[PDB]
């Protein structure tokens, strides 16, 4: 039966159970044949699939859809035995997430789905047929796969021509290879985002050749050493260079040729000195340089040479002072200096009339310059664990200040003029409860009355 009916997954029974089957065969083989289905894993699997379809009705999946950070319909499947066929009846679904689903098969009925754009295959080996594979080759934008072995990734990944984003979160470091498995990335010439996370030691040649048309490349080695040796010069049009936890320990010399970069981050790269800003003058589109979670003794005086800085970050560093030339760039909007060993802020920061968000948490700033409050375009000011005894009385002239935090500070006085602002609610100003009671209550009722909506 297991060789004729393709139910080959019927293990032979042992003693005292084979004998009864032989007796039944001597009486009638039909009883044995009909009882044989319950001993096959295939029948159990398809019964599980049918029970999943009956249980996971259309309404349940419809209600289970969520909104992701990217503001699109998303569905998350966790530890499920399979994909219910009622899932593919949600034409409005756009993002599908699969995690720890064993032996997952994508039916052609996925072509019924139309809004689907992102696929998440976390530790799942996906088997797809020809029509569904064509449907994915035509109507799939982003792909997320998590794995620990090379083999468990889909072998048809390179067959998806219209893919735009790829997310690898596995261990591609195989046995003394130049990352052969990912070498198929040359097939996908339409790729925009590559999210390799495999603790790279050397940048694969495939990535170097494919980055000439890549837009957002993020690599996370989790502190594993990374070496360039002129590997960023091949790319000419890349804009994002996330190098989180790649153990650079120094700013690479291959980044200078990428003048088209706009967003750069070097978090947890064990940097020592960043005096190479003079080599970043070639980058006239560099506006989002991020250097937090690093070890910088002091900021070079070469920041003032650049003027295009819009998003600057040097958080979680040990810098004793901020040179005034850094304030020359007037177009900063998201400059944040949190967890820094700073002593005081120069008054030149008051010329940053275009700044929006500034985070000065965990800073030993004794006083705030009155010149800084002269700007009116400030949007966010975060102050946590700072050496402050009082708040300047000229903050009341601010009207565009959306939010401000004073947590962890040993303040004792809240000026009254703070209470007059067109844009001020309870969520915007969060401070200590005891410090909140020092202000006159007549405006508290007015504010709380408008806190509803």
């Amino acid at each position, epitope marked *: 039966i297991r060789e004729e009916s393709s139910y080959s997954d019927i293990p032979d029974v042992k003693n005292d159970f084979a004998f009864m089957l032989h007796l039944i065969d001597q009486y009638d083989p039909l009883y044995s044949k009909r009882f044989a289905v319950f001993l096959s894993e295939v029948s159990e699997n398809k019964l599980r699939q049918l029970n999943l379809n009956n249980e996971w009705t259309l309404d349940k999946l419809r209600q289970r859809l969520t909104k992701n950070a990217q503001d699109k319909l998303e569905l998350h499947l966790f530890m499920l035995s399979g994909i219910p066929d009622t899932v593919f009846d949600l034409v409005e679904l756009e993002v599908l997430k699969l995690e720890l689903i064993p032996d997952v098969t994508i039916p052609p009925s996925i072509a019924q789905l139309t809004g689907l754009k992102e696929l998440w295959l976390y530790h799942t080996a996906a088997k797809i047929e*020809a029509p569904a*594979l*064509a449907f994915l*080759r035509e109507n799939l934008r982003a792909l997320h796969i998590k794995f620990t072995d090379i083999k468990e990734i889909p*072998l*048809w990944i*390179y*067959s998806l*021509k219209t893919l735009e984003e790829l997310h690898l979160t596995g261990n591609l470091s*195989a*046995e*003394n*290879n*130049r990352y*052969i498995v990912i*070498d*198929g990335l*040359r*097939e996908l010439k339409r790729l925009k985002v590559l999210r390799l996370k495999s603790n790279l030691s050397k940048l694969p*040649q495939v990535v170097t*050749d494919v980055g000439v048309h890549l837009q957002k490349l993020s690599i996370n080695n989790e502190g594993t050493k990374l070496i360039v040796l002129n590997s960023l010069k091949k790319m000419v049009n890349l804009t994002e260079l996330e190098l989180i936890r790649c153990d650079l320990e120094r700013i690479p010399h291959s980044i200078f040729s990428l003048h088209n970069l706009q967003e750069i981050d070097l978090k947890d790269n064990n940097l020592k000195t960043i005096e190479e800003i003079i080599s970043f003058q070639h980058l006239h589109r560099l506006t989002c340089l991020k250097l937090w979670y690093n070890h910088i003794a002091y900021i070079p005086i070469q920041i003032g040479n650049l003027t295009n800085l819009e998003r600057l970050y040097l958080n979680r560093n040990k810098i004793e002072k901020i040179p005034t030339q850094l304030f020359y760039c007037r177009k900063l909007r998201y400059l944040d200096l949190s967890h820094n060993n700073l002593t005081f802020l120069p008054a030149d920061i008051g010329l940053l009339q275009n700044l929006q968000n500034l985070a000065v948490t965990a800073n030993r700033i004794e006083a705030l310059p009155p010149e800084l409050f002269q700007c009116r375009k400030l949007r966010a000011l975060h102050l946590g664990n700072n050496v402050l005894q009082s708040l300047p009385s000229r903050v009341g002239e601010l009207t565009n200040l959306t939010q401000i935090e004073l947590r962890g500070n040993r303040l004792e006085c809240l000026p009254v003029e703070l209470g007059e602002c067109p844009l001020l609610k309870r969520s915007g100003l969060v401070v200590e409860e005891d410090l909140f009671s020092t202000l006159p209550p007549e405006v508290k009722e007015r504010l709380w009355r408008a806190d509803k909506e």
Partner: nanobody
């Protein structure tokens, strides 16, 4: 179905000219972005030659750049690779690799049988 067979692989003294050929299947040679791979003994399999569909652009690794010429020939569904003056490091086993199938039914990737070439 879809299958590929290597041919032309053989031992040859250094400096000779070799023309590896592949016999393909129902998938178009004009389509079906194609690879010529090598596996070296005492080493890991590494890609050598790449021929693309819709433009016929050639890709090579730096170690195999300069003295290897790959092409795809239609009306006979063949992939050819010429190596001139092969060095001793060329001793390996060469396969034809299909990473993208034809226009329709987009069948899974299949590895070639392979032929062993040796340089003395």
């Amino acid at each position: 179905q879809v299958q590929l067979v290597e041919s032309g692989g053989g031992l040859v003294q250094a400096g000779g000219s070799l023309r590896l050929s592949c016999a393909a299947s129902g998938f178009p040679v004009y389509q079906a972005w194609m690879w010529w791979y090598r596996q070296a003994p005492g080493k890991e399999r590494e890609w050598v030659a790449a021929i693309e569909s819709e433009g016929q652009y050639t890709w090579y690794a730096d170690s195999v750049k300069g003295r290897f010429t790959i092409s795809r020939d239609n009306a006979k569904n063949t992939v050819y690779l010429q190596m001139n003056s092969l060095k001793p490091e060329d001793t390996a086993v060469y396969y034809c690799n299909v990473k993208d199938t034809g226009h329709t039914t987009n069948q899974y990737d299949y590895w070639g049988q392979g032929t062993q070439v040796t340089v003395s």
